[PDB]
Nucleic acid binder design. Structure first.
Lengths: 156, 153
DNA sequence: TGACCAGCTGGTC
DNA sequence: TGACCAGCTGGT
């Protein structure tokens, strides 16, 4: 084993507690799909992830659904979307506002809300491309953090 | 907003310290790609990750590292679009399978290329028989890993 | 950037 | 068991 394993063992009880808090809030895996980051957004915003949800989508206390996206700005400046983007995928969240969270690594820095009207520019862009090139899936097209900060409404 | 935020703030320094430890060991995000669990496997096995979750041992041998939570599912994920190009890379290295119950690590197995060929052959044959259609995440059963691999933890 | 290159997984019949 | 249906991203 590596010598740093002892440091890991010292930190584990707290990691455990964090996973327990995540579970208490509907997140059963903090180490995948930004699970440990999602928990921060949820506790700050008041949003919830329901059992049996489709992916990282949440709802407010009024039942409104939201698509939640996370980005590590220490590494990239474009929000990922879907590995096989096409009109069917766009339809999945065309009707809901999106919550974009910006992180420096694992720590939350800001959160923005964009309404469908704010995202139409990208839905149309992707549709336009798909219709022209023989209906090919787009491999994870990105939404600029700059675009999100300019068009969205900061909520954290 | 939610009252539990204070608990999260209480736990944060330690979580950041864990992320710092992962960073020191070449893992950029403990909350993606099983980052926090891959660190544990690297620290237990002595393997290291170079600048996928692929790792290398002290002799330079590369490995594919897989992880699974056995409380939820019975089969290890492979690739969302399995085809001969992916299988070609796979055949080149042994695989390290980590088994978890929640976040509690239970065991780690090593399988040699010869021990996974049964599946590479199956996946290859199917890709052609389907009309060159990628397979969507075929699974390698935990049972298979335990019966054909060597327990290293 | 536009648009193409990548990986890490769980679920249910 | 195998076959299929899904998800979250970073990198250039």
């Amino acid at each position: 084993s590596h010598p740093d394993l002892n440091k890991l063992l010292e930190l584990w009880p707290h990691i455990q507690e964090y996973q327990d808090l995540a579970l208490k809030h509907g997140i059963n895996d903090i180490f995948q799909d930004n699970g440990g980051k999602l928990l921060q957004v949820l506790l700050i915003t008041g949003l919830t992830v329901l059992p049996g949800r489709e992916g990282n989508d949440a709802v407010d206390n009024a039942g409104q659904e939201y698509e939640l996206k996370s980005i590590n700005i220490d590494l990239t400046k474009g929000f990922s979307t879907h590995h096989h983007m096409n009109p069917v995928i766009i339809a999945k969240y065309r009707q809901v506002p999106w919550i974009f969270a910006i992180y420096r690594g694992i720590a939350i820095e800001a959160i923005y809300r964009l309404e469908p009207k704010d995202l139409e520019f990208y839905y149309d862009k992707w549709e336009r491309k798909w219709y022209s090139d023989g209906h090919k899936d787009i491999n994870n097209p990105k939404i600029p953090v700059k675009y999100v900060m300019e068009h969205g409404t900061k909520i954290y």
